Amino acid sequence: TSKTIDMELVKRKRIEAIRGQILSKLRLASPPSQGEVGPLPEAVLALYNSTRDRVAGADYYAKEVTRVLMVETHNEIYDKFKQSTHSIYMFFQTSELREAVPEPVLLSRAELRLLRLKLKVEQHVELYQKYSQNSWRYLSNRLLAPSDSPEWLSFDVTGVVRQWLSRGGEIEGFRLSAHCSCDSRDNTLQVDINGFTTGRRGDLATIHGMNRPFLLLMATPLERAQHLLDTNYCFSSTEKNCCVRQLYIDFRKDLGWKWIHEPKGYHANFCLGPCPLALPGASAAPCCVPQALEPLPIVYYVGRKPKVEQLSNMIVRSCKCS
Amino acid sequence: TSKTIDMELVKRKRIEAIRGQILSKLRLASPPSQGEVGPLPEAVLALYNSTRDRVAGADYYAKEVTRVLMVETHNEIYDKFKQSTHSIYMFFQTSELREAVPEPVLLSRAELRLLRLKLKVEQHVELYQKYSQNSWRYLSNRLLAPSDSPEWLSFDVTGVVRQWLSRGGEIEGFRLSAHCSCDSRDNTLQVDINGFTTGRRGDLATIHGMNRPFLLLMATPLERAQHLLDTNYCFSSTEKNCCVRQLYIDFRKDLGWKWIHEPKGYHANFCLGPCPLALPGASAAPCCVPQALEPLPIVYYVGRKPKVEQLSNMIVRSCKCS
Ligand SMILES: *[C@@H]1O[C@H](CO)[C@@H](O[C@@H]2O[C@H](CO)[C@@H](O[C@@H]3O[C@H](CO)[C@@H](O)[C@H](O)[C@@H]3O)[C@H](O)[C@H]2NC(C)=O)[C@H](O)[C@H]1NC(C)=O
Ligand SMILES: *[C@@H]1O[C@H](CO)[C@@H](O[C@@H]2O[C@H](CO)[C@@H](O[C@@H]3O[C@H](CO)[C@@H](O)[C@H](O)[C@@H]3O)[C@H](O)[C@H]2NC(C)=O)[C@H](O)[C@H]1NC(C)=O
């Protein structure tokens, strides 16, 4: 009767809020048209598919998504890196990476994606960044699960691509090689090579044809680009917006407590400010709520025995509207 | 005049909220006493110090903090692992680990801590978990920064310690060994050993005397223990508390939009419910706000050229009170 509609009304409220959320995120005053193009082309479907199932691991405005495939194997130059059975090389032309992203500042997230298909043994791999000529800098670690069905893998390589877009040669790239562990005893050193158990190399990742390694990019488009953990505080913002008000709390002066031996006081902060769609969560009631929270360790005695305990979420480091 | 006091009143409000926050987090109806014990003993000061500067990287109720030093080197057994110049071994007695934590379920966070002092060259290290007898299972990776002043290091080892407390032998431990990289070409294999550049072993980490490797533990005490990313939804909670109401939004039926080619609709969810101190943020205005948020990739045409973009924070996966 009443309550039923009373909730259908609230749902209908956010539908008009999301209608404003999507348009404001796109910097669009009006909904556009369908476009000139039956079914969509497979170049954007593969790009949309690549984005639908994000693996592993947040600006408000929308981000343009583009992918750039690496230069084909047995094409251009593989002369330097021949006969490395346990290492897969990937190289990208910076001219076509700059074609996707006009300026390094626009890039917000870049992730290299590969296609693994092995199902029997796990593979421990490593990722390296090329420096100068044939000098390699370690990036990240990754273990591979024995999945019968192929699953995509991603590597967060944003900071590297931003340096590539800004300067350096036109040919930059990565190197996915096997992880080894070595423990030495009594003048004898054992090397346990892990990952790339099959010498074919083509058994671990897909390197020929379509579905080859590419570099997925997420950047702000240039039309949007115009205008547009770090602590936030109310004095530095110079605005009435939601911020962090610092409040030192003494246990002796404020709470009147004497039982906490350490610390004598701590910087408990709180949020404050009104949240006003052109002016992020698009909820039915935006609030000034904290985002970042640190714990607070304290010391006190319980009878004869002291206790050192940590209280979670006692200090506010950053607020936000939602 | 007015506004000044009007803000001092709000600050005084949260002081009584934090007064309830700290006591409710400790399950204390009243503030306790100072205790039987001038300056505090150095055993809890080192334990309080260990907690004050947490490095690297959230239950509501307080967590008991205890540390357990590893068995002394050149003491008990080091016979098996002698002459491993690039590997530091650490072993803990499970009887005294069970002395700190009575049941594996109580343990919420465990972190092994070491003391590094090198300043010249960076050290790339690895961490391993002992399996059976002299079988090692990789845990995590870590690079070490050349700091002139010593800095503490931590390793999240919670899942391992919980398995140790539940079953297994009484002597379990870890192994911190150097990371090596190996790239093979033309029947020649190069091994670049990184970390532990000095053969002294005692140059990288502190292994004798006090400030030796210990295992920091954070668990719920047994007196508190009685009673007390996974998606949350309003139908499953069976309560009026703040939860997630699912709402499928069709672009054709609800928004009337036809320009988004893919997807045809998405599961935009919203938060709802009243937040009621015995009944987490302890702010001046608790709100039902979302915690987990996923992006939403969409596809649409701009004139002749299509665009595939991702909109951040469009789907709500979990709400919370703050
Ligand atoms: C990208 O992912 C989409 C789905 O997210 C894939 O779309 C799929 O395309 C196939 C066409 O080969 C569809 O099969 C069709 O099934 C219907 C029955 O529903 C049948 O009548 C048709 O004759 C055809 O067999 C499939 O349904 C469709 N997936 C979904 C969920 O509708 C697409 O193929 C992927 N593209 C790439 C390049 O990975
Ligand atoms: C654990 O950390 C605490 C600080 O977080 C350390 O407390 C420090 O203890 C020394 C005593 O050796 C204090 O020095 C004192 O300075 C005052 C002047 O303020 C002087 O009058 C005294 O004669 C003495 O020299 C030092 O101030 C104090 N730190 C602070 C911030 O007050 C403690 O030593 C650490 N313990 C361990 C085991 O690491």
If contacts are CB pairs under 8 Å, which of residues 155-194 in chain A contact chain B? 177-178, 180-186, 189, 191, 193
Whether B249 sits inside 8 A of A33 (CB atoms) is no
Nearest chain B residue to A219, by CA? B309
Question: What CA–CA distance (Å, rounded) separates A58 from B313?
Answer: 8
Cα separation, B258 vs B268, in Å, equals: 18
Q: What is the DSSP string of B65-109?
A: EEEEEPPPTTSS--STTTT-TTEEEEEEEHHHHHHH-SSGGGEEE
| Domain boundaries, position B295 | 230-322
Name the residue among A22, A272, A284 with its Cβ closest to that of B270: A284
Residues of chain B numbered 122-161 and touching chain A (CB < 8 Å): 124, 126, 136, 138, 141, 143
Distance of CA A47 from the midpoint of ligand 1 (Å): 15
Of B208, B229, B250, the one marking the end of a domain is B229
Residue A222 shares a structural domain with residue A130: yes
> What are the CA-CA distances from residue A172 to residues A133, A153, B283 (Å)?
10, 20, 50
The total number of structural domains that make up chain A: 2
Cβ atoms B191, A191 nearer than 8 A: yes
Q: How far is Cα A294 from Cα A266, in angstroms, rounded to an integer?
A: 12
The CATH number of the domain holding residue A136 is 2.60.120.970
Sheet with A107-116: strands ordered across: A151-156, A107-116, A214-219, A63-69, B305-321, B288-302, B260-262
Instruction: Classify B52 as helix, strand or coil.
Output: helix
Q: Indicate if A262 and A155 belong to the same structural domain.
A: no
Nearest 5°: CA angle at B317, between B258 and B294? 55
Q: Which two tokens stand for residue A249?
A: 């709390």
Q: Which of A173, A199, A229 is the last residue of a domain?
A: A229
Same domain, B142 and B241: no
Breaks (C-N over 2.5 A) in chain B follow: 37, 57, 228, 276, 279
Ligand 2 within 6 A of CB of B181: no
Q: Whose CA is closest to A181, among A122, A124, A127?
A: A124
Confirm if B123 and B151 have CB atoms less than 8 A apart.
no
CA dist A7 → A11, A14, B271 (Å): 6, 11, 12
CA dihedral B223, B224, B228, B231 (to 10 degrees): -130
If one counts every other C-beta atom within 10 angstroms of the C-beta of residue A130, the result is 21
Candidates B141, B246, B289, partner chain A, best to mutate (most A CBs within 10 A):
B289
Ligand 2 geometric centre to CA of B170 (Å): 38
Q: What whole-number distance in Å separates Cα of residue A48 and Cα of residue A42?
A: 9
Measured in Å, residue A261 CA sits from the centre of ligand 2 at 14
- The Cα-based distances of A136 to A1, A175, B112, B143 in angstroms read 68, 8, 31, 15
B32 to chain A: nearest residue by CA? A259
End-to-end CA distance of chain B, in Å? Answer: 30
Inter-residue contact A287 to A316 (CB < 8 Å): no
The last residue of one of the domains, among A187, A204, A229, is A229
Shortest alpha-carbon distance between residue A89 and chain B (Å): 12
Contact of B235 with B68, CB cutoff 8 Å: no
Alpha-carbon gap: A298 to the closest alpha carbon of chain B (Å)? 7
Decide: residue A217, CB within 10 A, 0-12 exposed, 13-18 middle, 19+ buried: buried
Same domain, A100 and A7: yes
Neighbours of B3 (CB within 10 A): 7
Determine contact, residues B262/A47, Cβ cutoff 8 Å: no
Q: Are A271 and A316 in contact (CB under 8 A)?
A: yes
Contacts of B42 in chain A (CB under 8 A): none
Provide the token pair at B3: 């506004």
| A residues 95-114 lying closer than 8 A (beta carbon) to B | none
In this structure, are A40 and A106 located in the same domain?
Answer: yes
Atom 5 of ligand 2, residue of closest alpha carbon? B49
Any atom of ligand 2 within 6 Å of the Cβ of B49: yes
Q: What is the CA radius of gyration of chain B?
A: 27
Together in a domain, A15 and A94: yes
Amino acid identity, position A262: E
Rounded CA separation B220/B143 (Å): 32
- Amino acid identity, residue B154? S
Report which residue type is found at A199.
Answer: G
B77 and B24 in one domain? yes
Experimental method: X-ray
Q: Cis peptide leading into A263, omega within 30 of 0?
A: yes
Report CA-CA distances (Å) from A80 to A74, A133, B143, B186.
12, 10, 29, 11
- Classify B264 as helix, strand or coil: coil
Select the residue of A40, A218, A245 nearest B261 (Cβ to Cβ): A40
Q: How far is the CA of A267 from the centre of ligand 2 (A)?
A: 20
DSSP β-ladder status, A270-272 and B63-69: unpaired
The residue written with tokens 């294999």 in the block is: B189
Q: Which member of B15, B63, B186 has the closest CB to residue A249?
A: B15
The backbone torsions φ and ψ at residue A305, rounded to the nearest 5 degrees and listed phi first, read: -100, 125
Instruction: Give the one of A58, A126, A191 whose C-beta lies nearest to B191's C-beta.
Output: A191
On whether any CB of chain B is under 8 Å from the CB of A83, the answer is yes
Task: For residues B59 and B89, state if they share a domain.
Answer: yes
Is there a single domain that holds both residue A131 and residue A55?
Answer: yes
Q: What six digits make up the tokens of B50?
A: 């260990």
Residue B63 identity (one-letter amino acid):
K
Q: What is the DSSP string of A199-250?
A: TTSTTTB--SSSS--EEEEEE--HHHHS-------HHHH-SSSSEEE--EEE
Q: What residues contact A176, with CB distance under 8 A and at least 6 apart?
A: A87, A88, A89, A90, A114, A125, A126, A127, A128, A205
In chain A, after which residues does the backbone break, taking C–N over 2.5 angstroms as a break? Answer: 37, 57, 228, 276, 279
CA distance B194 to B142: 11
Cα-based distances in Å from B292 to B74, B314, B320: 49, 10, 9
A183, A245, A257 ranked by CB distance to B31: nearest? A257
Neighbouring residues of A226: CB distance < 8 A, sequence distance ≥ 6 = none
Contacts of B11 in chain A (CB under 8 A): 245, 247, 270
CA distance A124 to A144: 6
Is A121 in the B-facing interface, judged by CB distances under 8 Å?
no
Identify which of A307, A294, A295 has the alpha carbon closest to the alpha carbon of residue B222.
A307
Q: How far is CA A264 from each of CA A138, A253, A254, A270, A313, rounded to the nearest angstrom?
A: 44, 10, 11, 19, 18
Q: Which structure tokens are listed for A124?
A: 């421990």
| A280, A153: one domain | no
Q: How far is the CA of A36 from the centre of ligand 1 (A)?
A: 22
Say whether residue B85 is in contact with chain A using an 8 A CB cutoff.
yes
SS3 state of residue B316: strand
Exposed e or buried b for every residue in B11-39, given b needs 16+ CB within 10 A?
A: eeebeebbbebbbbbbeeeebeeebeeee
**C-alpha–C-alpha distance, residues B293 and A307, integer Å:** 37
Closest ligand 1 atom number to CA of residue A48: 1
Residues A235 and A225 in one domain: no
For residue B264, how far is its CA from the centre of ligand 1 (angstroms)?
A: 14
Resolution, in Å, please?
2.9
DSSP per-residue letters across B199-259: TTSTTTB--SSSS--EEEEEE--HHHHS-------HHHH-SSSSEEE--EEETTTTS----
Sign of CA dihedral B127, B131, B136, B137: negative
User: At residue B169, what is the residue type?
Assistant: G
Nearest to A311, CA basis, from B27, B230, B276, B227? B27
B204: number of Cβ within 10 Å? 23
Q: How far is Cα B318 from Cα B271, in angstroms, rounded to an integer?
A: 8
Picking from B71, B65, B34, the residue whose alpha carbon sits closest to that of residue B50 is: B65
Q: Cα separation of B320 and B322, whole Å?
A: 7
Q: Which two tokens stand for residue B132?
A: 């059976």
Is A306 close to B40, i.e. CB distance below 8 A?
yes
d(CA A52, CA B220): 40
Q: Check CB contact under 8 Å for A283 and B289.
A: yes
> In ligand 2, which atom is closest to the CA atom of B52?
5
Q: Is the CB of B45 under 6 A from ligand 2?
A: yes
Return the residue of A nearest to B124 by Cα. A138
Of A5, A115, A118, A139, whose CA–CA distance to A55 is shortest?
A115
Distance between Cα A52 and ligand 1 center (Å): 14
CA of A263 to the centre of ligand 2 (A): 13
CA terminus-to-terminus distance, chain A:
30
User: Ligand 1: residues within 6 Å at CB?
Assistant: A 42, 45-46, 49
* Cα separation, A124 vs B115, whole angstroms: 28
Is the minimum CB–CB distance between B235 and chain A shorter than 8 Å?
A: no
d(CA B210, CA B246): 55
CB-CB under 8 Å, A283 with B312: no
Q: Are A166 and A295 in a shared domain?
A: no
